[PDB]
Amino acid sequence: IVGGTASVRGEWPWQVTLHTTSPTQRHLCGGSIIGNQWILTAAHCFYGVESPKILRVYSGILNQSEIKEDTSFFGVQEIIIHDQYKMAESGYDIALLKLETTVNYTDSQRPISLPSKGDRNVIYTDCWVTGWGYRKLRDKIQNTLQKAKIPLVTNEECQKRYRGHKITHKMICAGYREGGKDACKGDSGGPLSCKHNEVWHLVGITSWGEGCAQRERPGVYTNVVEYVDWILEKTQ
Ligand SMILES: COc1cccc(C(=O)O)c1OCCc1cc(-c2ccc3c(c2)[C@H](N)CO3)cc(C(C)C)c1
Structure with a gap:
C-alpha cells in the first residue's frame, strides 16, 4: 500500500496473508475470509504455483514478523480459479481457496x-x-x-x-x-x-x-x- x-x-479481521513455501517462504498475496473454510482472492496470485501443496493461509496476523516456525496456519485443500481467467488486466481475476479445516471466529479473524x-x-x-x-x-x-x-x-x-x-x-x-x-x-x-x-x-x-x-x-x-x-x- x-x-x-x-x-x-x-x-x-477478514484480511489473510497467503504464503508460498517454495523455493522460500514468503507472503505471496492477500485474501479475505468469506466463510468458515473459504478465502476469496485473485487468480493472478497463482502464476507458477504447481499445486495447493506449497500454500499456507495465515489468519489473525498484524505483523509478518509474528509468523514463526510454530505459528498455526491453514493448509489449502483446493484452489478454484475462474474458468475465464487469462491475465489480471483482462478480468476474471478471482479465485477461491478451500481450507483444510474451519476457521474459528474471534476478534482477530472473522468473515x-x-x-x-x-x-x-x-x-x-x-x-x-x-x-x-x-x-x-x-x-x-x-x-x-x-x-x-x-x-x-x-x-x-x-x-x-x-x-x-x-x-x-x-x-x-x-x-x-x-x-x-x-x-x-x-x-x-x-x-x-x-x-x-x-x-x-x-x-x-x-x-x-x-x-x-x-x-x-x-x-x-x-x-x-x-x-x-x-x-x-x-x-x-
Ligand atoms: C508474476 O507476478 C505476480 C505474481 C503473483 C502476485 C503478484 C502481485 O500482484 O502481488 C504478481 O505481481 C504482478 C505484477 C505487478 C503488480 C502490481 C500491482 C498490484 C496491485 C495493484 C497495482 C499494481 C495497482 N497500483 C493497484 O493494485 C505492481 C507491480 C510493480 C509496478 C510493483 C507489479
Whole structure:
C-alpha cells in the first residue's frame, strides 16, 4: 500500500496473508475470509504455483514478523480459479481457496459479507484497501498491515485513463486524481472493503494498475458483486 498507515490488531479481521513455501517462504498475496473454510482472492496470485501443496493461509496476523516456525496456519485443500481467467488486466481475476479445516471466529479473524443482494444503487463513500504490499516501486513486502482510504471512480472515468485496456463492469476502479494512495504488488488478492450502514462489505479484490499511486492511474479491482452467482455456486 502506497501512502497508507499502520493498522492495529483486530482492525481488518477478514484480511489473510497467503504464503508460498517454495523455493522460500514468503507472503505471496492477500485474501479475505468469506466463510468458515473459504478465502476469496485473485487468480493472478497463482502464476507458477504447481499445486495447493506449497500454500499456507495465515489468519489473525498484524505483523509478518509474528509468523514463526510454530505459528498455526491453514493448509489449502483446493484452489478454484475462474474458468475465464487469462491475465489480471483482462478480468476474471478471482479465485477461491478451500481450507483444510474451519476457521474459528474471534476478534482477530472473522468473515466479511459480500455486497448485498438488492444494494445495486448503493453509492460507497467509505472504502479502504489493505495489505502488506509495496509502498513504492522496487520495495519489499511490509511488516505491518497497511491501510489507505481510496475513493471509487466511475467505470467511464477509469476507461479514459486506460485506453489500451477494456475496463468492463466486472471491474471497479479507485484512486485519487493526483495519486499518492493506492494498492501495489503484494496487496493483490486482498480486499477493497467499504462500510455502509456500519457494516463492512467486500466490494473489490485488489487486481492491477499502471504502476502504483501514479496521477490519473487508478487501481483496478475485481468487482465482487458481479461474481456473487459464481462465488455462491462454488461455496454451496
Ligand atoms: C508474476 O507476478 C505476480 C505474481 C503473483 C502476485 C503478484 C502481485 O500482484 O502481488 C504478481 O505481481 C504482478 C505484477 C505487478 C503488480 C502490481 C500491482 C498490484 C496491485 C495493484 C497495482 C499494481 C495497482 N497500483 C493497484 O493494485 C505492481 C507491480 C510493480 C509496478 C510493483 C507489479
